[PDB]
């Protein structure tokens, strides 16, 4: 890999610079290089990996949705035939998005998850696995769509099981996992009632645990609780 000659610490340092410069493709490449050094990632390093790829795939997802909308309009009654270009370009962006998801999933499988023993690392990576299968499910339309959805579900479920056994209900990783799994249920799995129930129960169990927290931990947890509430307001 092109980062094979760069020191691990230099890759980390440059990932932080790339974030400051809003160079998220660079940030992701630096973090991929750091993962490929083979050592486990610290909490901060896991977060840099996630931020980098979240920004990259976020731009691709936004572009894909714009193009998909144009493509759908072109296939409406009365719409002038414009040739293959919209489909081709949507397919181009889709393939690139799938490539990024495959890259992230590949890092998780080789070998971040299998070396992650602590709940905070293991839940974090399993949540990420669910998230990137979810992004693949957003664009899937073929014979593997059901399997992609099931892969997302399975990763989220394993993360949930660990999080409930090993983390307090206010833990921000646990909360963000629940939030994202609820979005999976609503947007991917056609299960809005499961989505609502999960968000509700998560919010309520966190509320009851806030009294145990410092001021700074309280801020961290309540921020994510508000996202759960925002979704519940949209969905109900």
């Amino acid at each position: 890999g092109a980062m094979g000659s760069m020191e691990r610490a230099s890759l980390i340092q440059k990932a932080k610079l790339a974030e400051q410069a809003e160079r998220y493709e660079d940030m992701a490449a630096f973090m991929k290089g750091a993962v490929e050094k083979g050592e486990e990632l610290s909490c901060e390093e896991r977060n840099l990996l996630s931020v980098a790829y979240k920004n990259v795939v976020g731009g691709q997802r936004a572009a894909w949705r714009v193009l998909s909308s144009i493509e759908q309009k072109s296939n409406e009654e009365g719409s002038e035939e414009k040739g293959p270009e919209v489909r081709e370009y949507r397919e181009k962006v889709e393939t690139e998005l799938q490539g990024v998801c495959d890259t992230v999933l590949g890092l998780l499988d080789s070998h971040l998850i299998k070396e992650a023993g602590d709940a905070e690392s293991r839940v974090f990576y399993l949540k990420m696995k669910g998230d990137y299968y979810r992004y693949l499910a957003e664009v899937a339309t073929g014979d593997d769509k059901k399997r992609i959805i099931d892969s997302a579900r399975s990763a989220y479920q394993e993360a949930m099981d660990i999080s409930k056994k090993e983390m307090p209900p206010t833990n921000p990783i646990r909360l963000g996992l629940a939030l994202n799994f609820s979005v999976f249920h609503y947007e991917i799995a056609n299960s809005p009632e499961e989505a609502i129930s999960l968000a509700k129960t998560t919010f309520d169990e966190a509320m009851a645990d806030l009294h145990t927290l410092s001021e700074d931990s309280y801020k961290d947890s309540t921020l994510i609780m508000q996202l759960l509430r925002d979704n519940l307001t949209l969905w109900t």
């Binding site: 932080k16 974030e19 901060e44 977060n47 840099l48 996630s50 931020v51 979240k54 920004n55 976020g58 998230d131 963000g176 939030l179 994202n180 609820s182 979005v183 609503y186 947007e187 989505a195 994510i224 996202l227 925002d230 979704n231 949209l234 969905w235």
Partner: peptide
């Protein structure tokens, strides 16, 4: 609905 934004360290 929104997932975790997750775009800032």
């Amino acid at each position: 609905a929104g997932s975790i934004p997750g775009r800032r360290s």
